[PDB]
Design a protein around this ligand. Structure first.
Ligand SMILES: CC(C)CN(C[C@@H](O)[C@H](Cc1ccccc1)NC(=O)O[C@H]1CO[C@H]2OCC[C@H]21)S(=O)(=O)c1ccc(N)cc1
Ligand SMILES: [Cl-]
Ligand SMILES: [Cl-]
Lengths: 99, 99
């Protein structure tokens, strides 16, 4: 799969049984979702961004079905404007930037 | 050039005669710098991010030297935490996401 960038690189994901859309985001260290409810215990973290910070929940060892790949990662949950797939998951898909 | 994602995809760039480090950011629609001053008139714009919004200046037709390439693009200047290269400049590099 080669994906150009004339449009936002959005992919469909299955995460914790739910169907979501998310953004392939090389500028994100960590994968974060807004519109989901994950099972289990969590750890309080924070994420900093272009315009400020926000409290999040880190859920460890979460199954994500993305492109043809099935992967586990810690997932942050909080009020991001869009679901984002970050370098912790991108690296596991063997994702690379080419030019 | 093929770049993995185990570390932040940071690149050196010459922009408006100044040397900067910036992030290849497929999750960013637009290109934005924090630690520069560009010449000329500008248009007030805003950007929204993970944690909120901020006011920025859009400078049109700015020359950026990024890896081997020399391109023009509108550039946003404002209080971002890092410099980011977004899809408006990535497309001009013929940059793709591969896996
Ligand atoms: C969140 C996206 C929808 C958009 N963001 C681009 C994104 O890549 C930022 C880019 C970014 C990077 C560092 C600091 C601020 C913004 N990364 C980010 O928020 O990542 C957070 C999640 O993991 C951590 O990794 C880096 C910060 C954490 S954004 O910075 O807010 C943004 C929004 C609009 C434009 N034009 C350009 C950038
Ligand atoms: Cl994991
Ligand atoms: Cl231009």
């Amino acid at each position: 799969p080669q994906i150009t960038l004339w449009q936002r690189p959005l992919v469909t994901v299955k995460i914790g049984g739910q169907l979501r859309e998310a953004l392939l985001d090389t500028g994100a260290d960590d994968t974060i979702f807004e519109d989901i409810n994950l099972p289990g215990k969590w750890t309080p973290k924070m994420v900093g961004g272009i315009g400020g910070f926000m409290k999040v929940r880190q859920y460890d060892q979460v199954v994500i079905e993305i492109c043809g790949h099935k992967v586990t990662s810690p997932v942050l949950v909080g009020p991001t404007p869009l679901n984002i797939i970050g370098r912790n998951v991108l690296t596991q898909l063997g994702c690379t930037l080419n030019f």
